[PDB]
Amino acid sequence: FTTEIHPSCVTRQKVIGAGEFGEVYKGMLKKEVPVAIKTLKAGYTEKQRVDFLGEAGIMGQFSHHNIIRLEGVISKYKPMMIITEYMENGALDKFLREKDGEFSVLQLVGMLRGIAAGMKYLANMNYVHRDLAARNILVNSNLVCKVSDFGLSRVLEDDPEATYGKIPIRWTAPEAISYRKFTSASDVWSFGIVMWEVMTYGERPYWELSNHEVMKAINDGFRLPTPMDCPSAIYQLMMQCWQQERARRPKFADIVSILDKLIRAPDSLKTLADFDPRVSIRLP
Numbered sequence: 001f002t003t004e005i006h007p008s009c010v011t012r013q014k015v016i017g018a019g020e021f022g023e024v025y026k027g028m029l030k031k032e033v034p035v036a037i038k039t040l041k042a043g044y045t046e047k048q049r050v051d052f053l054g055e056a057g058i059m060g061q062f063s064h065h066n067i068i069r070l071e072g073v074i075s076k077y078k079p080m081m082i083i084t085e086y087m088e089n090g091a092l093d094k095f096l097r098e099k100d101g102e103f104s105v106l107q108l109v110g111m112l113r114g115i116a117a118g119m120k121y122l123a124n125m126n127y128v129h130r131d132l133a134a135r136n137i138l139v140n141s142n143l144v145c146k147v148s149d150f151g152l153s154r155v156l157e158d159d160p161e162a163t164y165g166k167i168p169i170r171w172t173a174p175e176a177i178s179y180r181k182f183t184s185a186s187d188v189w190s191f192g193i194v195m196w197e198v199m200t201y202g203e204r205p206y207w208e209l210s211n212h213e214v215m216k217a218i219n220d221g222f223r224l225p226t227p228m229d230c231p232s233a234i235y236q237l238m239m240q241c242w243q244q245e246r247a248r249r250p251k252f253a254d255i256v257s258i259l260d261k262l263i264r265a266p267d268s269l270k271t272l273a274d275f276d277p278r279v280s281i282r283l284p
């Protein structure tokens, strides 16, 4: 099933994420290998237990470089724990915002290829993520990006960015907002937003537009503008992720292939899409 770990092998050291029902810790697994540790405090309900251990069950079924690896679970003792590999650099959105401009275009594009490879794996495994966003991508000390945040109802319920179904509007495909059609193709729309987040170093999609204004703009055909210093091929790809008609979007296999080709002929990334400025500075 999954690996049951004895509590004596686990040492919690730092809180890296807290919540009402539990906390996420950085720790060590047997003071030897660093791990992340997610707990479930006493008094949890049946639904909370199913959702909590269900996340571990889903992760245990995956084995991919760009998907968070499960080390094991503590279920025989309390509190219960999910133990995974430790991603040293945290969530991608916060990571990019705190390292603004510090990476090359080729590095940024390689992050996107890793994310896409993880999503292609998930889609082929018949797993729809529903909440793909930079905040749900984790980064390690090799700059590898791994898709995180698995489960069923639990995913959108626990994301504060998801607003009342209960979804994160700015990242969500129109068919999923409109009539709750979540598929790998709505994940592709979300991946286009993640592309835009990466190339902007964590800019907030649609900026200060309200949720209703975002839905209104999308339905009227508006799309996010080109990031600064963005390869033309990258902007073209994210625009095709945002096709209103779900059947016109690339599959993840197409995305990975295109990103592979660009990275392997890296001069192709030097052709930038035009950036339309929001300030005019004219000097005599």
Ligand SMILES: Cc1cccc(Cl)c1NC(=O)c1cnc(Nc2cccc(C(=O)N[C@@H]3CCNC[C@H]3F)c2)s1
Pocket (backbone or CB within 6 Å): 016, 017, 024, 036, 037, 038, 055, 068, 082, 083, 084, 085, 086, 087, 088, 089, 090, 091, 138, 148, 149
């Ligand atoms: C444990 C677990 C259970 C179930 C699902 C999952 Cl995906 C997990 N694993 C995790 O939640 C995590 C795995 N790795 C994580 N790494 C992480 C997350 C958030 C912040 C940090 C972290 O150390 N962030 C910064 C990095 C730079 N400044 C110092 C640190 F605070 C690391 S969280």
